Design a protein around this ligand. Structure first.
Ligand SMILES: O[C@H]1C[C@H]2CC[C@@H](C1)N2Cc1ccccc1
Ligand SMILES: O[C@H]1C[C@H]2CC[C@@H](C1)N2Cc1ccccc1
Lengths: 299, 304
């Protein structure tokens, strides 16, 4: 048994609020007496072509910002900008503020997203940062202002905020400090996600998860070099394996007795020959949205 | 379009997290669902490992008193004031009503319907996932054996419809459980005996709703211009371990058929061709697999 789960979203639900600036309405993250939201809420329909956000911001009054928490409206008493997130100083601290951090993740790492609309949570799903720096998801997977997070024993690590949905069924955003993931801008302009690749380090972790649960038909007696595998994996649009990734898989290699370059040879043959009608953990396709720690932590 | 690259989402688990408690009977410990002044949990918490082969739950329960049960919610102990058995769920009455109690109902679901499960170990929520109710009356979940007492639920307008409680691991790695009234789904007993779930099939009505969702989003590569009779389709689908489509299922897909202009039996012929050819690289709504855990109810509502 092995099914992908998202973190319990209870701690994040208590922070979701509705932020409206003029005609634009989106989701905001209410922590203490500050509401975090994408800065493009201050954009006009007619001005999100090359906006000069800080000049538009220093002239919008606090009363332009409508903040709703359920049926309580929070009075905005201040506003400042950090990169691409808008900070709204409000007169009320959120009593449901959890123990939290602001962290930045890197491609291949996983987190949960609390999909929200008009500040009210609709659903939660588990996802990974694609190598192209996008997050797979539809317009029905949350609108602007939805946040991505991890939970580490009572502490919520906020790592992502939805900013825009790309036409290819993926969305892109920033961390909670305003820094985009990937080569994207918060402008209505022609933006496309680059050619996506498979997160190789996650596939091996998922293959380790199959070993730990007794699915070991794919294990072979061969070993490969790190680059001979990388030369093959890249040909199949699999994100190259670094020595960092080999190190992160260390505990799974020691616990299963399968060296990383041993499992790499198994994955290598899987790429060149397919699975030949067989399955792994009940799936006929290789899963790449399970980090090594996701496996260490569930298995 | 609207649903491009769509991902299955579980319902926000906040309202259920506030109900999870830890129930302990002697050395056995598992999860309980605290609603008002009643804690619901699997009745096999009163079993030891030796009792589980042939447990006499009436004999075991009649020997228990309120002080034999330890119920903990975070750091507070809940004194039990009453205990009764309803089928396969234990109901422990406590002196404290759950102030965190959400709006809730008890509902029994059918195979094919979907819900969220909050996986909990010793009363603490670990993770949440979205699953469907398999035709063989199991669910494919992920555990550690402590997940007994984890509940399945849906949320509609902040009212939490509880529909499942986990009881068993079956030897095939899937899970079996009851509704919140204690009635098992399928031919399973809360007994650690030789139980085998019948071979699982694919929820055909969910796949057809998934394919209708793709057409609404402009994903039409899999469509063919053929139609089929309902019997000819069922004759083919069952050989691929797909569920026989009933006239009820055809009626449920009505609004989807009318919204796209593709007859249900026409869609069935396209699915029949997908089964003989496979996808093998091509994707539908961004997924390289035929999704069978998204119900027509969810498709119709998200595509008005
Ligand atoms: O944006 C994604 C992450 C990185 C950068 C480009 C591509 C896609 N990745 C590298 C790569 C190249 C060849 C083969 C496999 C991976
Ligand atoms: O328990 C599940 C529901 C029903 C009855 C057994 C099986 C699985 N289903 C029938 C069936 C079998 C093969 C092919 C198509 C349908």
């Amino acid at each position: 048994g092995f099914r992908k789960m998202a973190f319990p979203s209870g701690k994040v639900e208590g922070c979701m609020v509705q932020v409206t600036c003029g005609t634009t309405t989106l989701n905001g993250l209410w922590l203490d007496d500050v509401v975090y939201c994408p800065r493009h809420v201050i954009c006009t329909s007619e001005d999100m072509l090359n906006p000069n956000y800080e000049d538009l911001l220093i002239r919008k009054s606090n009363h332009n910002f409508l903040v709703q928490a359920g049926n309580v409206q929070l009075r905005v008493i201040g506003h400042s900008m950090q990169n691409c997130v808008l900070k709204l100083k409000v007169d009320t601290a959120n009593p449901k503020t959890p123990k939290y951090k602001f962290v930045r993740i890197q491609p291949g790492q996983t987190f949960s997203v609390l999909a929200c609309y008009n500040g009210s949570p609709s659903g939660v799903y588990q996802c990974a940062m694609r190598p192209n720096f996008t997050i797979k998801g539809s317009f029905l997977n949350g609108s602007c202002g939805s946040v991505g997070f991890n939970i580490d024993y009572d502490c919520v690590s906020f790592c992502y905020m939805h900013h825009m949905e790309l036409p290819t069924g993926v969305h892109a955003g920033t961390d909670l400090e305003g820094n985009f993931y990937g080569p994207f801008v918060d402008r209505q302009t022609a933006q496309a996600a680059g050619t996506d690749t498979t997160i190789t380090v996650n596939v091996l972790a998922w293959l380790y998860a199959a070993v730990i649960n007794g699915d070991r038909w794919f294990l072979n007696r061969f070993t490969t070099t790190l680059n001979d595998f990388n030369l093959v994996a890249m040909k199949y649009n699999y994100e190259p394996l670094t020595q960092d990734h080999v190190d992160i898989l260390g505990p799974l290699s020691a616990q299963t007795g399968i060296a990383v370059l041993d499992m790499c040879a198994s994955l290598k043959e899987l790429l060149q020959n397919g699975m030949n009608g067989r399955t792994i953990l009940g799936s006929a396709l290789l899963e790449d949205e399970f980090t090594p720690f996701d496996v260490v932590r569930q298995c």
